[PDB]
Amino acid sequence: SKPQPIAAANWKSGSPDSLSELIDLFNSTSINHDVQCVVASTFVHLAMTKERLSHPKFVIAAQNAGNADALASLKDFGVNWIVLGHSERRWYYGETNEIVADKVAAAVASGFMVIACIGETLQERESGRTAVVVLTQIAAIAKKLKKADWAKVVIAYEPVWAIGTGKVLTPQQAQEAHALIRSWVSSKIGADVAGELRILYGGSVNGKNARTLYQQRDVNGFLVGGASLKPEFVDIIKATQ
Template sequence: MDKERKLIIAGNWKMNKTVAEALDLVNGLKRELSNVKEVDIVVCPPFTALSEVSKAILDSNIRLGAQNMSEHNVGAFTGEIAAVMLKEFSVRYVILGHSERRQYQKESDDLIARKALAAHAASLKPIICVGETLQEREAGLTEKVLETQVRGSLAGLSRDQMVETIIAYEPVWAIGTGKTATTEQAQQAHAFIRSLLARLYDEATARKVRIQYGGSVKPSNARELMSQPDVDGALVGGASLEVRSFSDIVKNSI
């Protein structure tokens, strides 16, 4: 598939996998995906598995991501993890502002923006999640919600930092529900986000930013989703927990 931007497919393992299970999964992915060069492949295990998974993928084409980080670099923040700590495990990407954290941990756009700046200061690439709920979509508020989240979560990022930032459009109503946005709905939202980036930055910057789709991505719908002009990859939840399904999503995207 000839794309202007290199596809990036990341697996968000959420709160799943012991260290032993994580190694089983990542070793299987290494075998299945060793020849894939057209896609940036990222796995995001829980913090407890980062060290061992990092060693396991050292000489592979798989990159390591974390599921969250603190906006602070050091200090009295019990239970938090700093960017510099992630760097020790060769983490390159970090998911910020996932809808589950926005919902359960009450994370605000302002907090996510501060985390994004802290990530860039440590040369980590943030994957910033945005997306509307079912009620918001049904009320015709999708673009309003996306604009608020994008503007707020990217506040303070320079053009250069923006180019090194990934946005993940995840309609909340499609996460873990089995419902997927139609390819038209996904493309429409991605195109809107890119047009907003052009307004916030400029056309050239907007063209370089990769926008992933997330929300019940499966091997069966990956090819159609990735064929859309403004869909530059996927942030995969449940289907990233099995070697076969995640490998097939990657292979079907090419």
């Protein structure tokens, strides 16, 4: 068995029109297994997904929160999930491992479910440094969490060089990264926490490659950017069965 999977859409563009039709598609889709679906977006789409996205298996999420005022206003707005630490926050805007970890801790304290992102750059991968970089990232997050807080955290493992580039990990490479992360959590945090933790893969997931990725033992679902703007996101949800 695995914990409950997550199928998360990450909307980083799109037309208003294109995306309320996607919400209507999601609302009309039959999902017959236990999966938590998530639609993360900016303020552009959140009033609409809060109101319009009716499917029982879906929740909405914010894509980021800059400060404590924003965390509190998003919660009061009705948002209970948030993505933190995503790719560009770290490498384009300069958030350190510790700033990401404090944001995760603050969000958990405020009552969010948090999708905390980790992942290595092209150079870190090719120079053999994936394990050291990614385990350093998650270690910083863990330093700010108490044992019981892990029930509110989800890890998204995303190679930076796979996000939006058409370069996806092979099933074996995804499984090796996720098994590494799982082993670190089990040793440092506990087998109980490791077995309940969702570790999602993201980085060019699409409806054709999702099933074989999901079949890997340590993959618990996906964080999906480009393919979540398209009807194939429904098949990515189906791939988590």
